[PDB]
Structure formats: structure tokens, C-alpha cells
């Protein structure tokens, strides 16, 4: 059975390059083309070219001429895509995807991209690894309904951040928001929970914030 | 290069209804047209290749039609799994281009938001920055105005916001807005407010608090 497994998230300074690998299994590597397709946060999809592992041929849209290189090692069934001269607009998720190989009557365009790797988030920024600081979000008093509390996870890099509540035991009512990119180059997000008022002074609410790229975890108590 | 236009970009429909999605190409692409489906955090999935052939294992409620310039993808009756983004992709001429995507979202009864406001913490004031958060919880449709007032002064461009995907259980949206001020700015004013406008309330709702009078 068919899988494409790509390598882990990377972060890069502008000017540098990135090489993403794609290990295939469940099929004859040498009989299908490999495609690379990227997607920028919030945006659509952009084909970056393809390669035939069988013949070692490559082809790239003009957009990417000189910047993309695709290579393969047949012995370990893995494809590679390198992108150079990175700019912050190259920040995207990169996918490898497989399509039917040569070729009988353009069948390589006839069929589409049927199996995809899980994606690899590449981040180009001049920022540097930094853990978040977590601040509480609490109402101004215990009002005269239902209430809401939260965690503000400010100033970290890179993505992602995971947040649970009371060590995962609190699920119903949680909204964890997509991170925003701040103009300082650092990310920020908030996570909130709606609970009935009658329970405020009676149970503790903690949020659990994990940022694996900086290796930091923070349990933060919220109250009013 | 061939440009593909998808109409409309957004579609709101109930489970069970048919969906009709349009892909227009700037020049002819014969029948080399593919559709993909994508859900958040997931790789795209092939549905249709060569304009009208279903990919292996794709269920029969999807079918596509058209050739040359105008193409339709039809989802004959919508299941919860079918609310996603759909992309078309032309495969006649380099570079293989994708359209901008149509988002198929769930339609439900209008629901007013609950509004909450949070002052910056004392923890955070020690740094010389203040973040004030406003929360709009559980509303439908997606359109909402949030307005920041500080001592009646409207604040424009010093706040960022984001919105959750449509909610698993009740198809609602939620929104978080962060107004950031320097500590000096924050300490110099007294009233902070969050005014939100939404289809579900016949009157603009305001939540405020008084600095240091909390
Ligand atoms: C880089 C290349 O062309 N081929 C390598 C081969 O030399 C190596 O012994 C093997 C083990 O990881 O991986 C493949
Ligand atoms: Cl070789
Ligand atoms: Cl399905
Ligand atoms: Cl004062």
C-alpha cells in the first residue's frame, strides 16, 4: 500500500536554501512521475514541476527556472526538491504528489495527481527560535449567564503551538484560534473556553501550552 | 499562461442539497481538466480527471462535465464530509495552473454572537506592551464588524484578528481580536471598548471596562 512520506518542518533565513525529501513505498518508484506543489498560508495551489525517476528527467515552470532542483535516489525510493534563494514569500506548505508515468498518448496529463505526501511546512523569515509567553485572559469581575476565559500565547517562532485545558480533560467550549503573524516577525494566538458562571469560583482552569521548536511547555492558571 | 477562474469563491448550502461549481479557462484546455478536494490541514485529494472521469474509489455523487473552456463539478447531494475547498486544474499547457478554489460551507439559521472583552494582565504590563482581547463567540454568518474604541477614539490598523473554521457540532464561527498598545498609551487612558455589528442583533453591541477600575 501506497504512501508518500515527506521530511519535517524547516525554518530558513532569506537567501538560504531548503531541500525537502519524499520517501515513497507500496509501488514501483520508477514508474510514476513525482510532482511538487506548494501552498502559501490562506492561498491556493502552485505547481513547481515534475520529475521522472525512471529517466531522471526534470521540468519546471519558467517562474522557477534556476531556483528549483529535483533529484532522486532510486535505491531508497526517495524524491527530493531543493529551492534556493529563499524569500519570505516562499513560506508555504510543500507537497510531493505522484502521477502516472510515461506516457502513451499524453496519459501523464490525462491522469492527475492521485497520492500526496502529508506536506512539509517551510518558513522563511529573518526571525529566530523563541518560546512564547503566556498571559491570562480573564473578565473584569464575576458579572451580574455564561463566562469566558483564556490564554494569550504571545511572541513565539516558529509555528506551531498546541493548547489544551486542564491537561486535556476540558474539551467542550474550547476555541483555539489560528495564529496571527505580527509585524515584528513573531506569532501570536489566543485560546478561549466558555463555561457557565455558577462554576467560576468552584474549579480551577489551567491552559497547557506546548511549543516544541523551542522545547517549552507552560501550565498557566486563569482566574478573576 | 492559461488562467482558470472559479465561481463563486464561496458557497453556502445545507447537507443534502446539490452543489454546482464552475471553472472557466481563459483559453481552451480541451478536456485536460482535473478537480481536487481539500480539507484544512490535509493534502488535496483527486476527484475528477480529464473533465469527467471519477478517480479510483471516488463516490458516484461527484461528477464533472464540460470541455474546452467551461467546466462544471457537480456534487449531487451534499454529505457532511463534502464541505471543503474545491480546486480545478488545467493540464493542457504549462505551467499546470490551478483555479483559486471554491469554498463549500454549511448554511444554518442566523445566530447572534456573545461578546466578551479582556483587559491586558498585570503579568503583561511589566514588558511595556498591552494587549486587549475581544471575543465574538458562536455566530453565523461569518461577516461581522468589530470596532475598537479607546476613550471614544476609534482605533484603526493597530489590531489583528482571526476566525475559527466552521464548528464541528453547530456550524458556528468564532472570532478573536487583539488591540495592542504600548504600556505608556494604555496607562494614559481610562475606557476601553469593543463594538460589534452582526446580522443577528438589531442593535450594535458594546462591551467595555475601565482601566484600573477593575
Ligand atoms: C546519495 C546517493 O546517491 N545514494 C545513497 C547511497 O550512496 C547510500 O549508501 C544510501 C544509504 O542511506 O542512500 C542512497
Ligand atoms: Cl544517476
Ligand atoms: Cl466520502
Ligand atoms: Cl489613573
Residue numbers in the entry:
A (entry chain H): 1 to 144, 147 to 226
B (entry chain L): 1 to 214
Task: Please give me the paper's original passages concerning this structure.
TRAIL activates two distinct receptors, TRAIL-R1 (DR4)5 and TRAIL-R2 (DR5)678, both of which possess a death domain (DD) in their cytoplasmic tail that can interact with the apoptotic machinery. The assembly and trimerization of TRAIL-R1 and TRAIL-R2 are prerequisites for transducing an apoptosis signal. We generated a novel anti-TRAIL-R2 monoclonal antibody, KMTR2, which acts as a direct agonist possessing the ability to induce apoptosis without cross-linking. KMTR2 can oligomerize soluble TRAIL-R2 fused with the Fc region of IgG (ecTRAIL-R2:Fc) and clusters membrane TRAIL-R2 on cell surfaces without cross-linking, inducing the death of human tumor cells in vitro and established tumors in vivo.
